[PDB]
Amino acid sequence: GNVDLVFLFDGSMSLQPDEFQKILDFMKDVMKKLSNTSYQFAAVQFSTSYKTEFDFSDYVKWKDPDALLKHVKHMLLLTNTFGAINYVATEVFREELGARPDATKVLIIITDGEATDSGNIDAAKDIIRYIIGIGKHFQTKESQETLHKFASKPASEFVKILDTFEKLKDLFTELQKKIYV
Numbered sequence: 206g207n208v209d210l211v212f213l214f215d216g217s218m219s220l221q222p223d224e225f226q227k228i229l230d231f232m233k234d235v236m237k238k239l240s241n242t243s244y245q246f247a248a249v250q251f252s253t254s255y256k257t258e259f260d261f262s263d264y265v266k267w268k269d270p271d272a273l274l275k276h277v278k279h280m281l282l283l284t285n286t287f288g289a290i291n292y293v294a295t296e297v298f299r300e301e302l303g304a305r306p307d308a309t310k311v312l313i314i315i316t317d318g319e320a321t322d323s324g325n326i327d328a329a330k331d332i333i334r335y336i337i338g339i340g341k342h343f344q345t346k347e348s349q350e351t352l353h354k355f356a357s358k359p360a361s362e363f364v365k366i367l368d369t370f371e372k373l374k375d376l377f378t379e380l381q382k383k384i385y386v
């Protein structure tokens with residue numbers, strides 16, 4: 206069947222330029238692996254505020270990850286994850302922007318920190334949510350457990366903690382045959 210998948214990617218001030226580029230390259234690798242499938246993609250950068258970098262209609266038009274992410278500018282602010290998830294649920298999964306009514310809705314969140322805001326994500330209850338937390342901010346179990354509230358359940362299946370940004374490519378290499386769900 207059809208999957209509408211959104212990447213919600215951290216553009217916070219804690220990321221070095223090299224680290225931000227590794228997030229971009231990962232999204233590109235995933236999209237390239239799934240080209241010519243029934244997946245459709247959108248990407249949203251989040252920091253203090255939220256920007257749709259490309260929507261589903263854009264993807265269908267260009268089908269070129271490198272082209273679609275060429276103009277991305279690193280926001281360099283905070284990490285308002287609650288607001289970001291709500292923004293995706295209400296502003297991105299919209300028929301007008303190319304979302305398909307019949308499709309399974311999936312959100313992949315990539316982040317290097319705890320949320321600096323609060324709230325709820327009731328609006329996103331129907332979206333399958335997979336979270337990748339990267340780096341030293343998730344060294345402790347307590348910080349890791351803050352991500353469980355954004356993820357689908359059970360957390361053991363929907364939260365992945367990576368110690369370095371190099372692990373994005375390593376895990377892609379290791380597990381790429383599993384991506385075509």
Ligand SMILES: CNC(=O)[C@H](Cc1ccc2ccccc2c1)N1CCC(=O)N(Cc2cnc3ccccc3c2)[C@@H](CC(C)C)C1=O
Nearest residue numbers: 208235309311333335365373376377380381383384385386
């Ligand atoms: C059955 N497939 C999986 O479990 C893979 C495993 C995987 C493979 C590559 C990875 C690369 C970096 C970090 C983590 C990775 C994890 N898996 C995890 C589970 C998941 O929910 N999704 C999201 C997803 C993707 N497509 C779906 C289609 C239908 C229903 C639910 C769906 C859920 C993806 C996430 C991955 C691309 C980071 C995934 O392939």
Ligand SMILES: [Mg+2]
Nearest residue numbers: 217219317318
């Ligand atoms: Mg950060």
